[PDB]
């Protein structure tokens, strides 16, 4: 099947703009959340999840028709968490009610980006709503407990490669690993809310230690108090990835671009876009407006 991008009718640039704004000043607002570490890493998650179904020999699941919004992809327990960054986007699809949900899942990971203050992403709109029966089963996202082989397989689907797979994987960066959602449990780093190279940085300079958590899986613990999980430890363990965490962690701005690419892609796969598409749009930040 062909999904064609179709621009929600007679939209443009600012309309999004104001999306991405009230996304931003709800970010900014409930800060609260997961012991303050606010809703950017969980909407970050949440973009990626709702593309990484995807698969390029049917071009089945990926962001276009937003199906994370029926019962079998909410529930799939690999996406346990993510009910609460689809509840930060409700109020937002409240007001905007006229933008897509694929628009808004994948809209929600690129705002949380830039105002945590990473790369620009640009961001095409276009996605359309696909009926329940399109919703793609459980079972097509990674599992963690793995090696860089699992990785690299896992990856060819969703069409990344190695310098992609480790350009997306610095989104650990963000956030932590929850005992009761995932098995696993901790932060990568300290800059948790802030988009840096820290994963990169990390896994090449604390001194990890293979321990057993209390769900009983193994993770790579640092006495900083940083976990790895065992595919995270995997781009240091082989060593076409290992060059490339290298790279990442030396070049700030080398990383901000590969991620910026690798992540509007994977946003993407699965659409068409008309050649009379509009371009890309570059969202400025909550800063950049002055708001
Ligand atoms: C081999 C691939 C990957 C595996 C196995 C993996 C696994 C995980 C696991 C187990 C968690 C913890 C969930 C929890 O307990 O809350 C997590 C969190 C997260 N992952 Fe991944 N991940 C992968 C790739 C990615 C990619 C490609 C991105 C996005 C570019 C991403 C972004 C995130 C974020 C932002 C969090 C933190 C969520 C939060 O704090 O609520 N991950 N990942």
């Known amino acids: 099947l062909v999904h064609v991008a179709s621009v929600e009718k007679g939209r443009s640039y600012e309309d999004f703009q104001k999306v991405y704004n009230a996304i931003a000043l709800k970010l900014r607002e409930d800060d609260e959340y997961d012991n303050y570490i606010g809703y950017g890493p969980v909407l970050v998650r949440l973009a990626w999840h709702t593309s990484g179904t995807w698969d390029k020999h049917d071009n089945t699941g990926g962001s276009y028709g937003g199906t994370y919004r029926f019962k079998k992809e ?64 459980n ?26 797979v480790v350009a997306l ?46 769900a009983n899986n193994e993770q790579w613990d640092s006495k900083s108090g940083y976990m790895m999980l065992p595919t995270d430890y995997s781009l240091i363990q082989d060593p076409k990835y290992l060059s490339i ?8 701005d080398k990383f901000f671009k590969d991620f910026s690419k690798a992540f509007e892609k994977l946003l993407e796969n699965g659409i068409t876009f008309p050649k009379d598409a509009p371009s890309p749009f570059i969202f400025k930040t909550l800063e950049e407006q002055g708001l």
């Open 74 to 137: 909410f529930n799939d327990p690999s996406n346990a968490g993510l009910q609460n960054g689809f509840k930060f986007l409700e109020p937002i699809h409240k007001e905007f009610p006229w933008i897509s949900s694929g628009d808004l899942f994948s809209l929600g990971g690129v705002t949380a980006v830039q105002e945590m203050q990473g790369p620009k992403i640009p961001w095409r709109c276009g996605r359309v709503d696909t009926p329940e029966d399109t919703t793609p089963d």
């Open 139 to 164: 079972g097509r996202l990674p599992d963690a407990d793995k090696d860089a082989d699992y990785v690299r397989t896992f990856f060819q689907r969703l069409n990344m490669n190695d310098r992609e």
């Open 169 to 214: 994987m610095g989104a650990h960066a963000l956030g932590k690993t929850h005992l009761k959602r995932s098995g696993y449990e901790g932060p990568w780093g300290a800059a948790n809310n802030v988009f840096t190279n820290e994963f990169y940085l990390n896994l090449l300079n604390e001194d990890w230690k293979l321990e057993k958590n209390d």
């Open 245 to 252: 965490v290298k790279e990442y962690a030396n070049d700030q």
